[PDB]
Design a protein that fits this description.
Blueprint (H helix, E strand, L loop, with lengths): L5 E5 L3 E3 L4 E7 L5 E6 L4 E5 L3 E4 L2 E8 L8 E9 L2 E2 L6 E6 L2
Parallel strand pairs: 2-10
Antiparallel strand pairs: 1-3, 3-7, 4-5, 4-8, 6-7, 8-9, 8-10
């Protein structure tokens, strides 16, 4: 019923060691919480700092300032739009490029 959210990586999914990456989670209007799921160590980041790009969309961002090899692995977005949590987004595979 709730649309599956989308995940994007900026500047991309292949990232030099020490560089930043920003994950953008997008979903329907009215999302209360976006959660970035970091599969490799089973951790996550939550944010209520949600805003809209348009009337039918909302989004949130998660930045890793300095990527390390430990940041490689699958990432997904999931959102809370009461009453329920959404399905998980398709995964994005973060890969580290030593150079």
């Amino acid at each position: 019923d709730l649309p599956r959210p989308s995940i994007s990586a900026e500047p991309g999914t292949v990232i030099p060691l020490g560089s930043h990456v920003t994950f953008v989670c997008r979903g329907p209007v009215g999302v209360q919480t976006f959660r970035l799921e970091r599969e490799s160590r089973s951790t996550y980041n939550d944010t209520e700092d949600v805003s809209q790009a348009s009337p039918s969309e909302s989004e949130a961002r998660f930045r890793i300032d300095s990527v390390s090899e430990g940041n490689a692995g699958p990432y997904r977005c999931i959102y809370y739009k009461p009453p329920k949590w959404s399905e998980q987004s398709d995964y994005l595979e973060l890969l580290v490029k030593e150079a």
